[PDB]
Amino acid sequence: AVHLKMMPEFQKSSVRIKNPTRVEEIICGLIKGGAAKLQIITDFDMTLSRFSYNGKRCPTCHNIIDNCKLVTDECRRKLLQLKEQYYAIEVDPVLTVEEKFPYMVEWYTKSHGLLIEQGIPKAKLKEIVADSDVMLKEGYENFFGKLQQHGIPVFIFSAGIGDVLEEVIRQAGVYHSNVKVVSNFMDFDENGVLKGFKGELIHVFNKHDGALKNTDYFSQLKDNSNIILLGDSQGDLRMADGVANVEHILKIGYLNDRVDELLEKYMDSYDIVLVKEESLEVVNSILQKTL
Amino acid sequence: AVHLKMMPEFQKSSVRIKNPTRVEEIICGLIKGGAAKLQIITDFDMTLSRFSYNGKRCPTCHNIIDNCKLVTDECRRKLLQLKEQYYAIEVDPVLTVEEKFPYMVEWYTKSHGLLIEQGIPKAKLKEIVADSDVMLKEGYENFFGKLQQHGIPVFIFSAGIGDVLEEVIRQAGVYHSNVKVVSNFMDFDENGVLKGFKGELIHVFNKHDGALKNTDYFSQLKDNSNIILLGDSQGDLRMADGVANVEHILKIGYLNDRVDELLEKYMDSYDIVLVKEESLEVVNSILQKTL
C-alpha cells in the first residue's frame, strides 16, 4: 500500500493535495509497474529549474539570452516592454485559452526576432550559460541519476530555447541518454550565428500539438504506460496527449506565482500541487518507492 | 599545422602509421572544422572496451551473458564449441568476406538461440553487468566527457548485445545524450524474459547494411562532415557508409590479436593502427587539438 501520511516529503506545508486517496491509488499503480512501465514527461523552466534563489528571481532559458553580454540594454528594454503587454494577456482572466493563442504566437515571434537581431553565435552559448544565474531545483542530481540508473525515458517538453536548455543540463552533468529534449531550437547560418528558429513554435498553450507531433517517440514506448507528468502551468497538463496507452498517470504542478488566484484551479487539475517549492524531493520520493 | 612527432601519444611503440603526412592533413581538416563539423562512429567490443587486463582476457558483451550465473556450464560448453567452429571460418584466409556472411549469420543465430534457452530476465542485467569483468579502455571518462561537453554525436555501432552494452556504459557513467547505440537488442516477453532479438542481425561483415539503414540519424547530422571512426576489424571500416557528406575522415584501428598476420592489412586500410593498446589516449589527443 501507499501512504502519504508516512512520507515526510508529503508533510511539507508546500504540498497541497485535493484528493489524497486518489493520489495513493495512482502511486500504488506506479509502484506495481516498476521501472519497466514508467516514463517521465516534464516541463523545464520553473519546473526543473528554480523560480527563485537568495531572495532573487531565477532566469528562464529565454532570460539567459535576454540578460547576457551579447545583448544591448535597449534590446532588454524592448523585451521587457513585450513581456509587460503580452503577459497581461497570458494572465487575463476574461479571454479563453484559445483566444490567447494568437497573442502567444506574436510574443515569442516578436521576442525571438529581437534576439535574432542581436547576433547570437552558437559558440558563445557555453560561456553565456556558464556565467548565467540559472539554478536547477534542489535534488536534480538524484532526480536525473535515479532515472538514468533505471533507464527511465524522460521527455522534456519546453516552450523555452532548446539550445540553452540543453547547455544548462549538459553543464550540470545530467543530460543523460534517457533524456529527450523537445523545444524551440535555434537555426544557425553559415557562420554559426542565430538566424531563426526550427520547426513549429512551442508556447504555453499549444503543447497538445507538439505532444501529437511526437508519435514517433511515444510509439517506441508503448509499454511505458505509467506516467509522471511535471509542469508549472495549466498548459503543461496537455504534455501527455500523445502517449500510446495510459494505465496510471500522476500529475504534479509547481505553483510558483499567483498563488491565491490559481491555487483552487491547480488543486482541481493537478494531482499534487507544490506551492512555492524549489526542490524535486516529492517526485524523488515517489521514484524511490517505484524504481 | 599538425606535427605527429610533437604529440607524445603518437610516439608509443603501439602506434603504427603507414602514411603520417596523410594522417597530419586529415587531423588538420578536423582541427579546422572544430566541434560544429565533428561526429564519432565507433565499434564497442575490444574498441571502447579492453581486450585484456591483469594478464587476463576481458569479456565482450556476449561473454558477459555467456559467463553469468544465469547460464549453465553445459550451455557454455556448447557456446565454446560454436566459437571454435565458426571462428575458424571468420579467420579463414581462403574464403572471401562475402562467402563468410552465411556462416556469421549462423553463428550469432545459434549462439543467441542458446542464450534465449537459458531464460534471461531484463531485471537481472544490472546485477550481471555489475559482477562481470568488463573493462573500458583507459581514458574513456575523458573520451566520453569531452564529447558530451562539446555535444559531439557518437554513434556506437556494435555487433554485440545492445542491452548489455548500454548497461556497461550507464554503470560507467558515460551514457550521455550525445551517444546513440545501434546494436542487437533483446526482445522480451510478457514477463520481461529474453525471447529473441530485434530487427536485422548486425554481425562483423554487414555493417554497410546497418550504416545505410540509419539514414534518418545521418541526415540530421548533414553538417558533421568530419568523422573519426574507431574499430577493431576490417568490417568496421564500413561503419561510415551512411554518412551524408564526407569532408575529412580519420580511421583508427585496434589490432588486438593476430598481429603478425593482420598488421600489413590494418596498416594499408586504417590510417592509424593501435597495436595491443588498451587506452583511448591517441584519440583523446586528437580531440584535445580539435574541440
UniProtKB/Swiss-Prot annotation, chains A, B:
Tissue expression summary: Isoform 2 is highly expressed in the brain, heart, spleen, kidney and blood. Isoform 2 is expressed (at protein level) in the spleen, skeletal muscle and gastrointestinal epithelia.
Catalytic activity: N(7)-methyl-GMP + H2O = N(7)-methylguanosine + phosphate; a ribonucleoside 5'-phosphate + H2O = a ribonucleoside + phosphate
Enzyme Commission number(s) of this protein: 3.1.3.5, 3.1.3.91
Residue positions binding CMP: E90
GO-annotated cellular components: cytoplasm; cytosol; endoplasmic reticulum; mitochondrion; nuclear body
InterPro entries for this protein: HAD-like_sf, HAD_sf, Pyrimidine_nucleotidase_eu
Location relative to the cell: Cytoplasm
Swiss-Prot/TrEMBL keywords: Cytoplasm, Hydrolase, Magnesium, Metal-binding, Nucleotide metabolism, Nucleotide-binding, Phosphoprotein, Transferase
EC top class, as a word: hydrolase
Biological process terms in GO annotation: adenosine metabolic process; CMP catabolic process; dCMP catabolic process; dTMP catabolic process; dUMP catabolic process; UMP catabolic process
List of catalytic residues: D43 (nucleophile), D45 (proton donor)
Entry-linked SUPFAM superfamilies: HAD-like
NCBIfam families linked: HAD-SF-IB, HAD-SF-IE
Subunit structure: Monomer.
Family, per entry: Belongs to the pyrimidine 5'-nucleotidase family.
Protein function: Nucleotidase which shows specific activity towards cytidine monophosphate (CMP) and 7-methylguanosine monophosphate (m(7)GMP). CMP seems to be the preferred substrate.
Protein name in UniProt: Cytosolic 5'-nucleotidase 3A
Taxonomic lineage of the native organism: Eukaryota, Metazoa, Chordata, Craniata, Vertebrata
Gene: Nt5c3a
